[PDB]
């Protein structure tokens, strides 16, 4: 909105859109984090800590 | 005065570029030496002719025949013909 205002004049996005924004952002973040952890499980990223915890 | 060491295409492995460049340069330099021999012959012939005048034929027969003989063989011929062909086979 700062870069290119929707209606010429800058106005902070409404609370509905910001609430939306938080909801979807959390979804993307959780997807990314789940992917990182699973990739550790497959042995694609570094997984020493996870390996030990699994063995125990 | 530089006297780089002579290299031949027959001995070398063509995968070492330094040796291949040396072979190309050596072949060229030998051709140029042969040219110098031809020019020395020709200069001797010129001096012979100029001093012998009317009897230059008898005086300079040997030089004239030799110059005419070395003309077709002592020019440049370039290395591509011999590096790209192996005369044995």
């Amino acid at each position: 909105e700062w870069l290119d205002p929707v209606k010429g004049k800058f106005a902070r996005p409404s609370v509905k859109f910001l609430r939306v924004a938080t909801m979807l952002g959390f979804a993307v973040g959780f997807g990314a984090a789940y992917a990182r952890s699973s990739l550790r499980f497959f042995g694609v990223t570094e997984n020493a800590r996870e390996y030990k915890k699994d063995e125990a | 005065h530089q006297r780089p060491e002579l290299v031949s295409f027959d001995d070398i492995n063509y995968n070492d570029h330094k040796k291949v460049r040396e072979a190309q340069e050596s072949y060229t330099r030998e051709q140029f030496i042969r040219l110098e021999a031809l020019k020395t012959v020709r200069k001797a012939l010129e001096k012979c002719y100029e001093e012998s005048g009317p009897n230059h034929f008898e005086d300079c027969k040997n030089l004239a025949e030799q110059y005419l003989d070395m003309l077709p063989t002592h020019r440049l011929q370039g290395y591509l013909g011999y590096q790209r062909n192996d005369p044995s086979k």
């Binding site: 909105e1 870069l3 290119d4 929707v6 209606k7 010429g8 996005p13 859109f17 939306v20 924004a21 909801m23 979807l24 952002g25 979804a27 993307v28 973040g29 997807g31 990314a32 992917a35 990182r36 990739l39 497959f42 694609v44 990223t45 | -």
Partner: protein, 469 residues
């Protein structure tokens, strides 16, 4: 992420007012950007060309499909920006470019259909994804129902797509009847030697290829591209081409096909020759798209076409987006708006643009010379890789024809630049108006990619050698 976006967006667009369209589209633009950047690291799965079959052998995941997927997201981001942001803040442009209420949901669903086409490992999944994309793209054609041409276009598109879908379903079912299977993975060298599947597989390939408009069935698609709103044409001319071509490349069911050879030749000739006498901008661009689709069709005749195809499709996507965006920007300097769906229509309407905006014409020159294939722009390397592939596989006559077709198409590529660097009597004196920062930055990014991509060629091939070998 894509399914979650579709679901949420349906809920919101239901509960939002017509004035919130652009804000919603900005929201999704940023969401897709966030997904592209945060989830990119999943490339690491594909190290050593590791292939994964997923969903009970319905979907296939390898480096190739991951790349096509990222490319499709990048395209969707760029295309959604054109709707989510105003070029100018005047009344004229509010009338010219307003997003429909449901347009974004249709865009996301068509993207989902395209991704499912790419990943399809089984014919049932292929057919369902084809129908999903076909239906969504019918509706995108038809959503601007105030246009007579857009409605006529959507109906013609419905009928031609329906017939081609029936040809595809027939091919799938004949393959089932002969092999009692729905997967190409069941095919092997022994099976291809033993049985004559050529007719069935070529019918399937032709049914898919006529949907992106290869000759001699081009004209209906060029007419549709001409008659749709310009911001719709920027989308519907690109995504189906990518999905169908990528599926065919990945499947490799027409290797050394004589019929595909003849049809690729014909497509090159018709795309090059037929675009010469054009006077409308979008018909010129559609014949451009036909010729480039021919260049990509050639890659279906050979194995190990992954690098050449990926490079070509990426550079073509960038060049296509950029040329459409340049035509869009040049709208602000025309003195006659033809109508509210297609503001500029004739090539001659760009006449003298260099006197109004010199750097817009610079960008136009760069993209055009990429299309012609002038090094070191991306277009040159795309054509170079394609020639490398087809000459390695002994397609000599097709290479000669490709040369000739690039030459011929250079004429109507340079037609644009020619009229653009001519002189106009009424030259902009001044203006307070600023083009939107975001779209100008995006157009500039595309231009800089086309110009200076070649510096990364060797790095790209090094990466490729470890993810696709």
């Amino acid at each position: 992420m894509l399914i979650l976006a579709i679901i949420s967006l349906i809920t919101f667009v239901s509960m939002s007012k017509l004035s919130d369209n652009r804000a919603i589209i900005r929201l999704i633009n940023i969401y897709l950007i966030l997904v592209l950047v945060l989830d990119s690291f999943l490339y690491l799965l594909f190290l050593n060309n590791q292939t994964y079959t997923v969903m009970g052998e319905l979907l296939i995941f390898n480096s190739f499909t991951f790349y096509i997927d990222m490319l499709i997201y990048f395209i969707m981001i760029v295309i959604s920006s054109l709707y989510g942001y105003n070029l100018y803040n005047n009344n004229l442009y509010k009338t010219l470019f307003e997003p429909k209420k449901e347009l974004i949901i249709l865009f996301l669903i068509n993207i989902l259909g395209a991704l499912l086409i790419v990943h399809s490992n089984d014919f049932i999944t292929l057919f369902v994804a084809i129908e999903l994309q076909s239906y969504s793209i019918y509706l995108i054609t038809a959503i601007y129902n105030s246009s007579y041409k857009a409605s006529k276009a959507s109906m013609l598109y419905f009928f031609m797509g329906g017939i081609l879908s029936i040809l595809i379903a027939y091919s799938i079912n004949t393959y089932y009847s002969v092999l009692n299977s729905y997967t190409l993975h069941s095919l092997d060298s022994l099976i291809i030697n033993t049985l004559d599947l050529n007719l069935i597989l070529i019918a399937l390939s032709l049914g898919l290829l006529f949907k992106i408009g290869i000759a001699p069935l081009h004209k209906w698609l060029i007419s549709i591209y001409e008659n749709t709103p310009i911001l719709i044409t920027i989308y519907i001319s690109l995504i189906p081409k990518i999905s169908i071509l990528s599926y065919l490349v990945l499947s490799n069911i027409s290797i050394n096909s004589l019929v595909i050879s003849i049809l690729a030749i014909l497509t090159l000739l018709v795309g090059s020759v037929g675009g010469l006498l054009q006077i409308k901008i979008k018909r010129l661009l559609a014949f451009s798209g036909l010729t480039n689709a021919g260049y990509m069709m050639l890659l279906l005749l050979l194995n190990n076409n992954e690098f050449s195809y990926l490079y070509y499709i990426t550079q073509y996507s960038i060049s296509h987006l950029a040329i459409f965006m340049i035509i869009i920007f040049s709208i602000y300097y025309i003195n006659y708006i033809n109508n509210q769906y297609n503001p500029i229509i004739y090539v001659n309407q760009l006449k003298g643009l260099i006197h109004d905006n010199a750097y817009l014409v610079l960008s136009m020159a760069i993209v055009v010379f990429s299309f012609i294939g002038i090094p070191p722009l991306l277009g040159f390397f795309g054509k170079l890789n394609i020639l490398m592939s087809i000459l390695n596989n002994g397609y000599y006559f097709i290479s000669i024809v490709l040369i000739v077709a690039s030459l011929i198409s250079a004429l109507y590529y340079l037609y644009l630049l020619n009229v653009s660097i001519q002189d106009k009597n009424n030259i902009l004196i001044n203006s307070n108006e600023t083009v939107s920062s975001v779209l100008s930055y995006i157009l500039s990014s595309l231009i800089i990619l086309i110009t200076f991509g070649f510096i990364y060629n060797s790095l790209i091939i090094d990466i490729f050698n470890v993810y696709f070998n």
